[PDB]
From TrEMBL, chains A, C, D, E:
Zn(2+) binds at H153. GO terms for biological process: fusion of virus membrane with host plasma membrane. Homotrimer. Interacts with the inner capsid protein VP2. Interacts with the outer capsid glycoprotein VP7. Interacts with the outer capsid protein VP5*. Belongs to the rotavirus VP6 family. Its main location: virion. It comes from Rotavirus A. This is Intermediate capsid protein VP6. Ca(2+) binds at N266, D286. The keyword Metal-binding applies.
From TrEMBL, chain B:
This is Inner capsid protein VP2. Inner capsid protein that self-assembles to form an icosahedral capsid with a T=2 symmetry, which consists of 120 copies of VP2, with channels at each of its five-fold vertices. This capsid constitutes the innermost concentric layer of the viral mature particle. It encapsidates the polymerase VP1, the capping enzyme VP3 and the genomic dsRNA, thereby defining the core. It is found in: Virion. The chain holds residues 442 to 588 of 882 of the full protein. Transmembrane segments: none annotated. The N-terminus binds RNA. It is necessary for encapsidation of VP1 and VP3. The N-termini of 10 VP2 molecules form a cylindrical hub underneath each 5-fold axis of the inner capsid. Homodecamer; each decamer is made up of two conformers of VP2, called VP2A and VP2B. Interacts with a VP1-VP3 complex. Interacts with the intermediate capsid protein VP6. Interacts with NSP5. Interacts (via N-terminus) with NSP2.
TrEMBL record, chain F:
Sumoylated with SUMO1 and SUMO2. Sumoylation of viral proteins seems to have a positive role on viral replication. This is Intermediate capsid protein VP6. Homotrimer. Interacts with the inner capsid protein VP2. Interacts with the outer capsid glycoprotein VP7. Interacts with the outer capsid protein VP5*. Residues 62-73 are annotated as: Interaction with the inner capsid protein VP2. Intermediate capsid protein that self assembles to form an icosahedral capsid with a T=13 symmetry, which consists of 230 trimers of VP6, with channels at each of its five-fold vertices. This capsid constitutes the middle concentric layer of the viral mature particle. The innermost VP2 capsid and the intermediate VP6 capsid remain intact following cell entry to protect the dsRNA from degradation and to prevent unfavorable antiviral responses in the host cell during all the replication cycle of the virus. The VP6 trimer contains a zinc ion located at the center of the molecule. The zinc ion is not essential for either trimerization or transcription activity of the DLP. Zinc-depleted VP6 has an increased sensitivity to proteases. It is found in: Virion. The chain holds residues 1 to 133 of 397 of the full protein. Belongs to the rotavirus VP6 family.
């Protein structure tokens, strides 16, 4: 695993530094690495593929060393090295696709393919080169039990969920109370409603609350908070809880009163913010607790006072909502986000070669089903496959 | 080229030139190591007489234009781990020979003609088989022929 | 072109590595490159500028080599090198602005300025250094006909378009049917409507469809799909098709029934997703085909049943919409996106020096007009200018 | 300051390049740097912490050099170097937290902690290594008075603001005119309204305008402009100006007529765009001036003509809005954005160790209060602390 | 790939030049090539076939050199060389059929069979001989990004299409107007009709237009234009648009008035021709725009005037048509034509060995389906297979 | 006219026969033709174009001979010959376009451009190669 990154690092540098006309002292230490790759790899033989429609290929290495005697590199020296690099870079593609496609349930952090088990001998350890990427540095710190961290831009921490809750209801569905929400990606939009507009509430104030637990602990997040849910603002018809009938929701929107956002960790309040919108921070949390309340306005112009009567026909329903959005955070387990394409490389290999459903991952690599039940057996497999997908992205985009 | 010296384990079908050929990625030398091992006679009849003949590139002196390049190529090899005293004595001893290109192109041009002309007067077949005893060559006589 | 990147790479490293007090072995291989720049460049003379208001400057190189004899670098050695770097970094600015401003129609991939044609001789090829950036690596892989790829964050693949389509209409404009859409940037918001709410449709179901073709083939995309068009949710008045009269649209919103999203490639279905919202992937596609339908709810409470009568006056119009958004994808041609500023550097040079409209690019470098007719003659020019803009961004931000 | 980056650069490279089994020529120049760190640092002694709950620690350096005699590195050579790196990387954490927590008002660009003042002697200048990061390169260019630049993705340039303006009003609040806006993060949503729908305006056209001044000058921005404010599109009740009464706002939405966006610099028009939506550029500006107008439609179907009478009861109010959004721009001072987490590292240190409110920064590091009054005394402190937070992020995530 | 052409070139010349009785100096340089083939190929072993019903064969080379000592070649020298040529020419057939049958979607320009991947090593590069054919010269110019060109005789550039368009219609189908066309192969026959014969048109002139876009850009074409569509000249019955009913078309034919043919390139008029029939040229185009109009004759003899009344029963319908035909043109991508049989060799191999449908090519190698969606992924595969089919045609007809 | 075909015949064969890895005896007679082109063409100078929108270009030939000492051609020998062929093949394009564009009425079979009149001297007749088209 450490020597699979070390093969790809000095094939990336060999296509970049060994160019025509360059001075020899620019590449004087790469060629000592590239010649010492070849000496270790000669005489061995490998075999990749076999699962699904992934074809079986056999690999055999018998190459010669590079020359170490020029002052400026010429077109003979480049063209005799390109037909050696192009055989290794085809070998690393078929080892990385052989490993992203396999999985185990007992110990997923171990190598699973036949070729990567064979590269983990002490014979092949002399190919080891620097480990400077983000995923190979966190592969080594976490293997010694030291603290790691991945930096994300808009991480997919919330599974998809769109539902509601009725705290007061009747079969006519004309005097209701409760909340509605959408949790999707890295964004929460909750909105509380009350059809009577707190005409009989004590002190004309109705209290709402919405608690979102996370799956993993986030660290040093940057969060944007805005006092409107724009998705629950228009008239719509909504089905019932069991799909029997439908009910109508015609909102008018007040401002949210007495907003309190809390950031919990094992039930302890780490941060809190009271009527403070814009950008906020959250240093360590795993549970977000939103709290906001509706207050009936005590003074109303004649255009407003017609909307909220005392009797039963309520044609304009009051609505109070919020909107939260995580911009960037630092987690310790691997996730998906909006910047890098490591999830897209894993699913595209499995979909292309028609791979059967195994014992660990959900069918079709569904991210909503995978972050919902994000077991420690799935975490060790998901890190092992995102790290191999990161190695393949250096050579083959 | 700084490579490790090899062991042969005296048994294989592969001569040391044949192993040292796919081991070296140099154009100038491996063009020469590929001629020298697949350099053999050609078995074909004229007029009822089977005779053994050679390539075109030895019948003219054209192959010596590669022996130049290959020997000259390594006359600049910095020779790592070698003492510079013994290094300069062997890099100059190769330029005793590589600087004589026009006189060795014509020497193998004459050697092939005298072999060609005198084999017109052969009547029996030129049957090739390893002789039990052996006429002996000294490489002192070859250095005396070249220089 | 390859030697223009190689000038900028070792002037960036010369301002970073040649600092005061550093050890000599840290910079022992850069100085051998920087001295070998100077030997190649002396005695030559150049000329940049001339088009628009870009002034004409003459360049002449007569410099001395750097010293290679200290153990730790001192302030004499730094200050005698800064007054050599500052002349080269002024030369590279005026060659990069001379090339981003010119264009051709026959073969746009060739150099166009007078200075960059002169740098493409074999005399100047010994200045060549490593080619490790993203755009100079894809310049070399694509020049040998090998497969390339650019990674984007929210790529501007859709031209701006906001229109509608009426599948049923009359001059009164009170019983309508059709779709509305906005395609802008990397986001599609389509919404289908029906004023009668499928009272006379067979099985009370109305079918909608919206097909978006792309200009270039995208690969391994990460796509977010949400079941509401929030832009077509409020009451508005819309003009007619020929601008004669105006018509009114008062929506209420049901949920989208039986959603199917397909990802086509040469008419072949690569991926498909049926009633699956959240984050999805798309491994290889060039056409997105959205399909969704409206179904009249069979059971309605008395608050809902007043909205949808049987007769002609329909005051509340039914609406069903979707929302699609591409987060990140990998294309093979150059595009614009939301992360990097290569399009902004090209237009800012042309606007500053008052450059006339040439034969290839649209007037004012309009991206909506350029991705609409994205010919292969414009693709070769756009890659040649984004690559020069990437070289200039290393030295001068 | 320059030698604090140089300590962290060669401790990051020491954990990456000194691995087991690697060839010695790969690390032959790092060990000459790492041994020359140790020679300079021995015999000295330091002291960090003391403010807030940050504990006081004493540091003392007495270490031995590394061996320079192997061909391939073995597990003795790695394990004898890891117990030297782990003492230095603990020292750099406590110097970086000692500097992010302190501030001054006279000259904030000078070092404030006791340890960083001691590292600024000429004895410690031989530890200096390459300065290749973005923040340490802009630390050095700006220290010599040369032009710098930071590249941002969605920069937090606007403070949070949500308000309105009534150009025509009466205590009944039934015939109003004016604009509403939200400025938050990097997004402007302005919307103008008119209850009479220009029935008595000259030529039935009502003119709106909204001018947003910036705090710092942005350069080469990429801006998305869309012709709808989706936040001011639904019915809501709004309080009065002094919080006395409430007033009702029931919108219908026309399209914006005759849109002009201008980009000012010292009162001079740099760029202008007239009825051009989608993606636009802005090369140099510090003031955005939006202009748009409402026009009554001259032809109306019978469904539209009922909405806008001639008399006083106006139940459907006209609304025209825009939406602007900055995707990426280049500023010269430091800011916050949506990609990097340098603001989150500064506040998380101050919140964890219970640090009292000093003379410069707002209480709680409120970004809305800090970009509102962004004085040159706060700019020098904010750059000095974001640069230290960038050094700490290399070693400890 | 370059060495597969070089095997077939010197086996074609070996059967032609090594004949009985010829002088030795005629073949003195071929034998040095043919002996140097054998030295490179000995000791290796190969394997072809495996897909479909193509059988698996194993290849092994152990041959002796040819004699270089005769003056005139005799029947011993010919018959000892024919039993060496006949083994190589059987090997090249099974490598060429192994490559025409395989395809890939990622990078189709790379070799796909197992034998051709093995021939692309630097060991086999010394077999390289001259590259003088048309397809191997364009294989090498296009591999370095230089401009190529293929010369065709009647190229199959148009997919098959036969349809119509009604600009004026009613369910009785007795007063119609529109165009009819056939696009097939390299020939366009368009014909416009009008049942009323422009009795109520302004100035008794009816305008027609027909626009044909191409798939690839053609260069220096020779085009024949004739003023009659002979296919739409006889009475026929035609179905409706949806296959519901049938309608009758009884033509009489006038001459086409005011003919204008335009040759477009990115919307720019390259060439134009106005009332000029016969042979014309077209130097650079990718869109053909035909324009022609019907004019009612102002003077009519009594035999003509009965045909065109003023009232509704029109029993003789007016018809105006054109005919265009491309004789020869130069394209840059590969196509099919009427002279060479490279498309017929590819399909005959796939049909004979019962090859399953792969991911790229249409089922059955349908040329109408392949030129309709002629993607750049299909272009790289189609050139790679036509080039292998051109190599096989030298040895085996 | 006969020497304009002879320039194009041995530039077509030079891009086809001078490939990487080929044996030297395959190209042993082409290089004697290609070196003997260069010796005749050095020191001369030409001028094409001028009519219509055809631009005026000046041509000048100062090149070195090719090596005749390898056994198999390598990538140094190919890449040093491609940057000589690419200058001649640009020269022949602008002489052929200069001649297809001009015409005369007295004797049209004579050369009309300035460059093709200059190539019809007996100095340039040694470039003559086979005439097989
Ligand atoms: Zn983003």
């Amino acid at each position: 695993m450490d020597v699979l990154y070390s093969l790809s690092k000095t094939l990336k540098d060999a296509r970049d530094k060994i160019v025509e006309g360059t001075l020899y002292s620019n590449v004087s230490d790469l060629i000592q690495q590239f010649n010492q790759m070849i000496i270790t790899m000669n005489g061995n033989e490998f075999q990749t593929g076999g699962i699904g429609n992934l074809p079986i290929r056999n690999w055999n290495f018998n190459f010669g060393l590079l020359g170490t005697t020029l002052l400026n590199l010429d077109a003979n020296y480049v063209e005799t090295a390109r037909n050696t690099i192009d055989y290794f870079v085809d070998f690393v593609d078929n080892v990385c696709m052989d490993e992203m496609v396999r999985e185990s349930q007992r110990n997923g952090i171990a190598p699973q393919s036949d070729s990567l088990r064979k590269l983990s001998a002490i014979k092949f350890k002399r190919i080891n080169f620097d480990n400077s990427s983000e995923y190979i540095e966190n592969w080594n710190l976490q293997n010694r039990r030291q603290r790691t961290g991945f930096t994300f831009h808009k991480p997919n921490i919330f599974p998809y969920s769109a539902s509601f809750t009725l705290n007061r209801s009747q079969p006519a569905h004309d005097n209701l109370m409760g909340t509605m929400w959408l949790n999707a990606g890295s964004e929460i939009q909750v909105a509380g409603f009350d059809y009577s507009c707190a005409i009989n509430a004590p002190a004309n104030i109705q209290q709402f609350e919405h608690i979102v637990p996370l799956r993993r602990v986030l660290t040093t997040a940057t969060i944007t908070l805005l006092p409107d849910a724009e998705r629950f603002s228009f008239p719509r018809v909504i089905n019932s809880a069991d799909g029997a009938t439908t009910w109508f929701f015609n909102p008018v929107i007040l401002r949210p009163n007495n907003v309190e956002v809390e950031f919990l960790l094992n039930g302890q309040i780490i941060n809190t913010y009271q009527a403070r919108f814009g950008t906020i921070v959250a240093r360590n949390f795993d549970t977000i607790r939103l709290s906001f309340q509706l207050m009936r306005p005590p003074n109303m112009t004649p255009a407003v006072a017609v909307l909220f009567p005392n009797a039963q026909p309520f044609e304009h329903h009051a609505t109070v909502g919020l909107t939260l959005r995580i911009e960037s955070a630092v987690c310790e387990s691997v996730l998906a986000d909006a910047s890098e394409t490591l999830l897209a490389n894993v699913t595209s290999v499995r979909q292309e070669y028609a791979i059967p459903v195994g014992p660990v991952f959900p069918p079709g690599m569904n991210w909503t089903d995978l972050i919902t039940n994000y077991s420690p057996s799935r975490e060790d497999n998901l890190q092992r496959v995102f790290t191999v997908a990161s190695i393949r992205s250096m050579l083959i985009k | 080229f700084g490579m490790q010296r090899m062991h042969y384990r005296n048994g294989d079908p592969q001569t040391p030139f044949q192993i040292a050929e796919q081991q070296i990625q140099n154009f100038q030398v491996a063009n020469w190591l590929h001629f020298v091992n697949y350099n053999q006679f050609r078995q074909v009849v004229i007029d009822g007489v089977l005779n053994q003949v050679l390539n075109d590139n030895i019948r003219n002196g054209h192959v010596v234009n590669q022996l130049m390049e290959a020997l000259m190529q390594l006359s600049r090899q910095q020779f790592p781990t070698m003492p510079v005293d013994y290094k300069r004595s062997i890099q100059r001893g190769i330029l005793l020979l590589s600087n004589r290109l026009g006189q060795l192109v014509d020497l193998t041009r004459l050697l092939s003609y005298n072999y060609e002309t005198l084999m017109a007067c052969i009547t029996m077949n030129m049957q090739h088989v390893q002789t039990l005893t052996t006429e002996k060559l000294q490489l002192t006589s070859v250095t005396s022929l070249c220089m």
